[PDB]
Design a protein around this ligand. Structure first.
Ligand SMILES: [Ca+2]
Ligand SMILES: [Ca+2]
Ligand SMILES: [Ca+2]
Ligand SMILES: [Ca+2]
Ligand SMILES: [Cl-]
Lengths: 21, 146
């Protein structure tokens, strides 16, 4: 689940940007 | 192709697993993380996951090995199965729906930080049918998008 956990981490990253604005 | 930043995001992921920072991910370490994610793999299953990435076969995964695999799966964006795997990590009770509680728990363990406000907004953005949960179809759209 190494890459799957990275995907989740990556989605949160994307979120914290679609938030930052 | 790889960049200085992407490498840091991967070192991020690697650190989650390499708890004692000895530079290697052991079978024991993988088990701890997997169990914190709601999975209960046997030692046999843990050995097999390590072996998939352990290119020089010394029994553990180092950063160069971790990077190799991560960069390769990334070059692949037809990883529908990788997305189901991420879904499974979230859906701890296996009912096919990711609840706000399930989402928060994984984020808190995956080294994240989410306020119940952010947890709700995360779901609300992906919750197409508005039932407050994120089903598989919704998860894909949420993950495959941006
Ligand atoms: Ca270690
Ligand atoms: Ca190795
Ligand atoms: Ca569930
Ligand atoms: Ca829904
Ligand atoms: Cl993987």
């Amino acid at each position: 689940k190494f890459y799957a956990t990275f995907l989740i981490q990556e989605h949160f990253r994307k979120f914290m940007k679609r938030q930052e604005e | 192709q790889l960049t200085e930043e992407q490498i840091a995001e991967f070192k991020e992921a690697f650190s989650l697993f390499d708890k004692d920072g000895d530079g290697t991910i052991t079978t024991k370490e993988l088990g701890t993380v997997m169990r914190s994610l709601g999975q209960n793999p046997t030692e046999a299953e843990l050995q097999d996951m390590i072996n998939e990435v352990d290119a020089d076969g010394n029994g553990t995964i180092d950063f160069p090995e971790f990077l190799t695999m991560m960069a390769r799966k990334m070059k692949d964006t037809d990883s529908e199965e990788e997305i189901r795997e991420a879904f499974r990590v979230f859906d701890k009770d296996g009912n096919g729906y990711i609840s706000a509680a399930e989402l928060r728990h994984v984020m808190t363990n995956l080294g994240e930080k989410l306020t119940d406000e952010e947890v709700d907004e995360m779901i609300r953005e992906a919750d197409i049918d508005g039932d407050g949960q994120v089903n598989y179809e919704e998860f894909v759209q949420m993950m495959t998008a941006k």
